[PDB]
Amino acid sequence: YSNERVEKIIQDLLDVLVKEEVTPDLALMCLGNAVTNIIAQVPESKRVAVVDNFTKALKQSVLEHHH
Amino acid sequence: NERVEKIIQDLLDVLVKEEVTPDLALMCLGNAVTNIIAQVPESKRVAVVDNFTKALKQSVL
Numbered sequence: 001y002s003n004e005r006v007e008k009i010i011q012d013l014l015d016v017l018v019k020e021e022v023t024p025d026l027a028l029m030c031l032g033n034a035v036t037n038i039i040a041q042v043p044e045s046k047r048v049a050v051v052d053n054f055t056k057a058l059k060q061s062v063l064e065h066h067h
Numbered sequence: 068n069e070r071v072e073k074i075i076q077d078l079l080d081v082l083v084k085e086e087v088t089p090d091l092a093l094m095c096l097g098n099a100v101t102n103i104i105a106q107v108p109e110s111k112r113v114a115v116v117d118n119f120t121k122a123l124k125q126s127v128l
Contacts, residue, residue, distance in 0.1 A: 013099040030074040036126045055120035
């Protein structure tokens with residue numbers, strides 16, 4: 001995927017939240033539900049692995065972005 | 068609420084609109100989430116990511 005497409009999609013996702021003036025807690029409740037909705041779109045035999053990779057990468061990125 | 072439901076749907080509409088792949092979808096959602104967590108106090112980030120991940124792992128099973 002082109003960095004451009006990926007970047008634009010992320011920004012479109014964040015715009016929805018900014019537009020709604022949500023707090024971080026609410027923003028996360030919504031994104032988490034969104035993610036669960038997507039993972040239910042992949043085969044049941046790949047869901048645990050996919051969620052595990054998603055979370056691992058997520059945590060790693062979160063630890064790395066502490067100033 | 069389900070002002071949550073409305074928001075959740077607005078988020079998924081973006082992905083549908085871009086005709087995205089599940090993997091591309093997850094890659095974008097993840098980046099979105101990291102961006103949000105960077106908006107909370109550092110002293111709370113690990114706990115937040117852990118609870119967020121635990122939630123997903125429980126809802127997938």
